[model samples]
Target: QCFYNESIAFFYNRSGKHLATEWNTVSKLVMGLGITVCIFIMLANLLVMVAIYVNRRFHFPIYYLMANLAAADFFAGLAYFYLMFNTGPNTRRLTVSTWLLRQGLIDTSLTASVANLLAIAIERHITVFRMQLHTRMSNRRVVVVIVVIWTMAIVMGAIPSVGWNCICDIENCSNMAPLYSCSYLVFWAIFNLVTFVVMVVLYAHIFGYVADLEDNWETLNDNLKVIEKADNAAQVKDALTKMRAAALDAQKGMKDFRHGFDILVGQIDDALKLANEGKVKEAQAAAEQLKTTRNAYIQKYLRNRDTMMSLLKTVVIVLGAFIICWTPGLVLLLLDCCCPQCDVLAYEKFFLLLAEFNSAMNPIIYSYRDKEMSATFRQILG
Candidate 1:
């Protein structure tokens, strides 16, 4: 019910104490690495925002998505920073009431990202599958979706502002529990599941469509039967040549689509297996791996020339979010699930900082990516 430094070992005894003792070492480790990721993403994304804003030529719906992604990372990092300084005996411990307010606000960044990711999937689906009507789905529509995603995400992550969330009465750290955390594991699970299903079906459709293209390519070339003269034969030969090239490209596209599909299926399988076998660590690792591999597969096969670069950028940057922002919490989740013999103190402290480290990572990446953000950062810091 209460946390005492003395009882910190409740989770792991002597090893727990060692983990707590290593708090400074862990904090430093997190800070050093977290800063590196944050700074890189921030700088990279900043240039992207600036480039887009200054070069009117580059304005596109995809830019809006990137901008929002940068914003989420930025706010998430700020939340992490607040937690990092306020937690640990070395820092001032917050009261329960105060932490509740802080965490409710901090959770918005993460919640927003979840919505943004889903929006992106839908956007890509529309662009690829509905080319005729894609032009009508203007930037305004996309921006509206991005804004709505953040608004809804913030509200969702604020479950603690209601009664479903609570901080541990101990040091007032960010709530990480499945039942009581603002992160709301139940809805999060549903979000992941729903999105995963949609993506699976969408990719299947893409595969079938690409198969149709292959059939069309073969049919067109076969129909190029020789006419009367050699001149007609040359014209037919040229047309067939172009069709063959298009077919080759379609095959490659299908391959990449299948790769992405396979990774998603593998991830779902691993998630279920891990849960079934009660191998939390294995499950956690697979979850992270799924995010990474999915990005790679999607990045490779992005068909739209206009959106291809932006998609690649998102995959890389969001990869930063997955591995950097959430790795610690995941490791902690694994510990909570699988490591009954785990050193409680050491792991707890490590987990706390890692979770903190997770939130702090986003801002750095975002700030680096957007020029308006840099100016905002200067204004805020100043």
Candidate 2:
């Protein structure tokens, strides 16, 4: 469950009695490296939050959920900072209250982030399955959901601090988390593990839904050409009729092409307004500009023939890194709970440090793979 002495080992024998040990040089390096990464995690998540806030384009429910994830990650950075800074026999000198504070902060961050993932997965699941193509949750509902997530997260994490701890029963103490109930750890780890599995499955279903519904799009997009070139309401009305006729005719086969089609529709509307007032050249130019914007995506990925694959790869990478990093720690925690005699003590910090690496990985991955996000980062940083 813990460490901080020679070679960052678990227990130390000072005068033949075992207590938490003092930090050595490697301890300093290990702990300091953790703290250094905490800073990076904090800044990266903070940047994510700011980007979402500053860009009106990110004002949707999904992005708001993403910002919530950033908040969780940022708070985790702070919690980890405290955990690493205080890593040592120093814990033996602390009052129960301070110990709880340290442990609870760490617990709270994990719970909050898992909840954020579940919420996001559910959001996508609900949106994509309905063929609506995107989430329609109002901002107020989004705020409420966020509040509920963290509030419940705190309550669950605080359970040990409040009453479920081993302070009253030494026999109930857990080696991984001193003064903690193994039962609680079992419950906590299993709960998070289940949620992780469910969310992973949910994402798979989402990808399946997208794959199933992805075969359309040409008719929907081609229908828009009429409106893009129209000069009057008569042409507009005619174009509308034809598109609707085709829409109804092919309504049997239509499914989830809404997002891309609607984006073009929005851009085309903006362009058509220019034509309405008689800036003919400007109208076409604006449409061309929007085309350029959409084409930015197409030329980068579609024409490249291997582009969208990378987008999928990026999401998988984020998830892959996250699960790999954290899942190892969770397994160790589970081992501590189920097998008391196992030598999990030595590798606890090893897995702990591994998990901490995830906090930095997320932001780096996002900035690297995401176009708009990196552009915003460049804007903010430069």
Candidate 3:
């Protein structure tokens, strides 16, 4: 007898299995709230997309990328709404509804979102390091990039539909299950891992660029003379304490800044050494620790004093949010695919929902943190 309720089951070996009960109340509450928030997110992103589309001021290559990101997120929200609609007490455990439409929608949306982020990261890197090359990123090239992003997203989502799905083996199917093979899951995980690594490197270079600017500031100060042309010795004497304290503060600030960099360097070295010694877990932990330390120092020193700097901060912040929302799902996916003894199916649904939350967050970040977007959003609302 087949179970017809919305209960999913987790399969261990051949003999062990557990049915995932509806936990219907919590599920309903989550789905209800999720659908509402997703609708709001979609509408907000649509406004942002339209605003960017019609405004000449936002006609730049970067803005085009931003518009595509918003579009991807808008679709993602809709996908979440559909998934919520399909999640009810009387729903079948292995319904064809999700396996057909919802899977492609969610997968394509997520893939496009991350791909757009990767494009943005690369664009920012070029803009920071080679302004002339960045200028050469014409609208045509950006459109090509957007097209390629959607193509990749489509390819990723299409794999399951073309017979790489788990649904062929009815015993393997579950709620919100990936119809794809384990290898496909591994491929997706690796793609995320490589992309996240590249993002980390790009951001590190950006932080390094900002740190160089601080070094220039310190160097300029070194070239300054506080008492170059004092009127009298008494004047020098009167200014000595203030000058000493100012120099001391500057020196201390520079020293602290330098020490922060030194610590980062040390952390990297230690992590590398650990990795070389086959201590992967330790290396990863060290790397994470280094990231925390570096971010703390960057936040302390890298104040957004200009429009360009502010834009950098906004992009970094949005990327950070993307990571926060997606990392849990990525980690769970990896464990599900690679770890034979891991039983994380119960947690995957929550993490998947958390991942979907990123789409809702992007427009919020863009509107709230960006002055122009905020103004345009207000005007549109008004």
Candidate 4:
């Protein structure tokens, strides 16, 4: 009544075979394709790291951490690359130790990626509240955080190899991963999923902080009114307008930025310049423009704004990609563990392949919108 395939190894048989003999041609082709993809993933992530280091604008802690994420992805590529060679028919041939190494490579790399993501979200959350961006830090601090992430990841993956694994009990070994047990899968999968949840909550809260904030531009409107009402002469008006213009011209990216405020202020400065140049009526006409522009800017990006929308868009985007990439494999891993009778092994490879695809994407996702990164990409690639 045992439903496991005799040709394959899972939960019972250790052929001690080193190479897959029963693999059909298609599996070989699939492995070849996966191998190529892994190399591509590695190179793409490497480009990201190179771009960040090469660009001065990306010298901040945020960019540096993303480089760490890229580091994770780069390793994922290698892990999955190794996995590609060791799976399918080959899974049957792998020794328990070899299998453990395979499993750990994937687990450790992905854990590092997720931990780095959480670290980034936490940094943004704390710094957003401080009226600062990027959670200012020293290189030593960045190095420590990065090291902590890897150290945590390594220990996490190493546990199965050292103690919690199914080396002695083949009966309870997972069909999905023969050397791993259900208890361990539950712990690993749930830990990662919970981290995802925490990141989403933190990102939303950061946006909430920004939602309650304002432009500090309307104070200029009041200043204009007060000066006009004081019966200031044209000479005095000219002086005031020019002064305001300089300050507004001092007009100012990421974490939280409002060009709309600057856009409105920019217009205001132009209006004041018109007044200073002997066009008081025209420049004052800008007073009307100011009201319209103020409302316009606020509606566009200020009055509980698109800066919010843009930020929300990015949050959703990163989370969306994360979910899309990981959900299928994660759910499959769970089902295979908790519902032992499910035939998840056949579909598992595809899910894992899809999951590995994510390692290829983070480089583009985080850096695509950044002008500096893209510019650096061009320069570096060129």
CA lDDT of each prediction against the hidden true structure: 0.50, 0.69, 0.65, 0.68
Q: How well is each residue in 1-382 modelled by candidate 2, as lDDT tens digits?
A: 2212222122222111235566567767877788789988988889888998999777877678878888888988999888887776655655556667888998998888888877877776665444332445467789999999999889987898777875655466677676677788898889888887887887787666445333333544554565577465555444434444443433232245445545655665665566567676565565555546556556543454344334445656766787888887887778876876656357777888887787778778878887778899877886
**Tens digit per residue, CA lDDT, model 3, 1-382:** 1323322332222213233346677777878788888888789789889888766677788888988998898878888887777665433454544445776788788888889989998888766554222444478899899999999989877876776655556444322343345656667778877888889898888777667556644532342232234343343333333323333333332012344445544554555566466555555555456446645644444442355666778888878988887877777666765665656457756777777777777777877778877777766667
Ten consecutive residues with minimal summed lDDT in candidate 4?
1-10
- Global CA lDDT of candidate 1, please? 0.50
TM-score versus the correct structure, for each prediction = 0.54, 0.70, 0.70, 0.71
Report clash pairs, candidate 4.
Answer: none
Candidate 4 CA-lDDT value? 0.68
Best-to-worst order by lDDT is 2, 4, 3, 1
Q: For each of the candidates, give the backbone clash count.
A: 18, 1, 2, 0
Residue 353 in candidate 2, Cα distance off native in Å: 1.2
Q: Model 4: runs farther than 4 Å from truth?
A: 1-20, 134-137, 214-316, 342-346
Over all chains combined, what TM-score does candidate 4 have?
Answer: 0.71
Better of 2 and 4 by TM-score: 4
Residue 235's C-alpha lDDT in candidate 1? 47
